[PDB]
Amino acid sequence: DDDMGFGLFD
Amino acid sequence: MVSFRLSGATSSSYGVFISNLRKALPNERKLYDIPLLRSSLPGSQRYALIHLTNYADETISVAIDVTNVYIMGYRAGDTSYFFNEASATEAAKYVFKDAMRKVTLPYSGNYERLQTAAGKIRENIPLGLPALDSAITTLFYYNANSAASALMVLIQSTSEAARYKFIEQQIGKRVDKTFLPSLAIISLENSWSALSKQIQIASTNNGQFESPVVLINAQNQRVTITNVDAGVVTSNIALLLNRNNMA
Numbered sequence: 572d573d574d575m576g577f578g579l580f581d
Numbered sequence: 582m583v584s585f586r587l588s589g590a591t592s593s594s595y596g597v598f599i600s601n602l603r604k605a606l607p608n609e610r611k612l613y614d615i616p617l618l619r620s621s622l623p624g625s626q627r628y629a630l631i632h633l634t635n636y637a638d639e640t641i642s643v644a645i646d647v648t649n650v651y652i653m654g655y656r657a658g659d660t661s662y663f664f665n666e667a668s669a670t671e672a673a674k675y676v677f678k679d680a681m682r683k684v685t686l687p688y689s690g691n692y693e694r695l696q697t698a699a700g701k702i703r704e705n706i707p708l709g710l711p712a713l714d715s716a717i718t719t720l721f722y723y724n725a726n727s728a729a730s731a732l733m734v735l736i737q738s739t740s741e742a743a744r745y746k747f748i749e750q751q752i753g754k755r756v757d758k759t760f761l762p763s764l765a766i767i768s769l770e771n772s773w774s775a776l777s778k779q780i781q782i783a784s785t786n787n788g789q790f791e792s793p794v795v796l797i798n799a800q801n802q803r804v805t806i807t808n809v810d811a812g813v814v815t816s817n818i819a820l821l822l823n824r825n826n827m828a
Binding site: 572574575576577578579580581 | 746747750751763765796798799800804805806811812813816817
């Protein structure tokens, strides 16, 4: 959780 | 059945809202633990009402097609407002029938038309729980000059949030302020039909996509999704549009 969305795409 | 009150809304109460919306959608089955929606239902079973209540206690009822969570139209007091498209003309045979006044919105439910009508791209429309509250208010009084923008807020805070955990969390975290949605959010909205289709295919193709889906991540990078180990499959998408929802 952030706004960096790390690991929620590719 | 599903209702949400903006008065006193928290990140949590918003999550409860979006889990209830998800839960109110029938599914065929799940794939990779992601509910796969029905392609088709009889008209009598195809529509559900979501009720949203602004700080002023004014309520709009929003009709969605439960096979795809597309918003068909909304009702405010004695007036129904339906998108100018065949899907909504059909819904208007089943929902909001005692509405004394029936309006056809001057656009389809499609972001390109909504953006043209708003004179605004989504990347410049604020989101957040207070944004949702102004949307409700705007739509309760039907400002025809502010309605298209407010339909894009509404769409993203229900339909889109329901479809993607990232969208949900990002909106619901803005409890007392608003934010401008990233290209990441937009990408996810644009790509829902294709990603969904690819995950379906992957299910009988050993987890491989047949066709890459290009997303924009939160760093604005173009990233290529080709399989079910992508974060968007395992930790974001929460509903699959059925490939047979249209011919």
